[PDB]
Amino acid sequence: VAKEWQENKSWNAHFTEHKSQGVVVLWNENKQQGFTNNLKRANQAFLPASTFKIPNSLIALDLGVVKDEHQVFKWDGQTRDIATWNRDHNLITAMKYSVVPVYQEFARQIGEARMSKMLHAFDYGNEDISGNVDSFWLDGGIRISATEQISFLRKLYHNKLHVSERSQRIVKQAMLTEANGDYIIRAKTGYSTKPKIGWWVGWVELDDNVWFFAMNMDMPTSDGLGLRQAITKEVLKQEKIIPF
Template sequence: MKTKISFLFFVFTLNLFSQNLEKDISEIFNDSDAAFILYDYNNQNFIKHNPERCAERFLPASTFKIPNSLIGLETGVIKDAEFVIPWDSSETWNPAWNKDHTLRSAIKYSVVPYYMELARRVGREKSQYYLNVFDYGNKTIGNIADFYWLDNSLRISADEQVLFIKKFYENKLPVLQRSIDVVKEIIIIDSTENYILRAKTGGGEKEDGNFIGWYVGYLETKSNIYLFALNVDAKTFEEMAPLRKELTIKVFKQLELIK
């Protein structure tokens, strides 16, 4: 009950402050069916584009690699960032996947077979346990226990993604600090003298045949932290893939968070 009340207060606060800078970023999304949330950590303010869509749940796709990595580390299936799961010699559409991978390289190249094998080794029961204690979206695995984050069984909203990332950033998930530290280190996308961007992309096919893209994470500047979640629809994967980071970076620059 406490978690549910906290989430409701979080969403209420999000809605209360979401209009502050919405006009500043709305033009960025004029040609896109998208949702975006940015949380100003120090000031506890939100910017929110498309509130209705922000509350709508979609498959998390490879953004689930953040919690999935935590699950692998917590259960002991994965020992550390350099833990190798061998390629099973099955050819995939992505040549980068067709080799042995470590946890570090698997999250960098979004290697689906690595995480499918991880899920098989963890098992349905333990996976379900962590979905529950993380309070992750609808917490549903469905019929296929090694593909549920991609087959529209598991669903999560942009609102919920930001709440999860907030708990992850604050080290408030019920996992060991070591597990959180490993995952925080392997999701660094950019590191400069002015900021560090930690994030994960995701992309998959929705039940209506369109593709959804995600970009989820947090930006650390010298003076503040900004948690964010973006999702965007497109008719093809190729159309969707570049939009995720492009739109997010445009927002950061529009708000002068980065140059």
């Protein structure tokens, strides 16, 4: 039988080396094959936390809540603990600094009915927006698995989500994280305080292939936040997707 998914338990070493637990899921676009260290956890659904900024951006652009990637969302003047939030932002910087209050305001403008309809249209996780319209992805009913993140991301990559191509192109620009002569990573981090879960989801663009990834890990302290990228990169390195 064609096994979409194969388990590679050797990747567990990358988690246990940091006394961590989690899952990395990879999808080889050319081969239409997925790999994970934990088939069960790969399919376990969690709060998306700030990974939700990807669908939230798309919806805000498609409904004209956000005009383009340069439109300024002025700071509301409330000083928050995260200094980078206490300034004006555009979509690019709001994504970069994971500026929750900008995205809360987008959610409020989108509203419950349109948010719910659009997540249904995206086939996004459990499509459930129960809770506050401006925090359901942090403390409400929405749940998504790593494999479901990859499904969603693959649609975004191919401009196949049910929003404009322009909206998808802008969000992909906003997701740009790293680029050099060897690869491009477009991705988004996420951190949920209850339960304590860290995410990193996105993809690695190579000359002749794209590798989608979605990882989550238990995140008891904020001290391990850098492990999201580090563990993922160790797997990408082991699989010769990116160089050492």
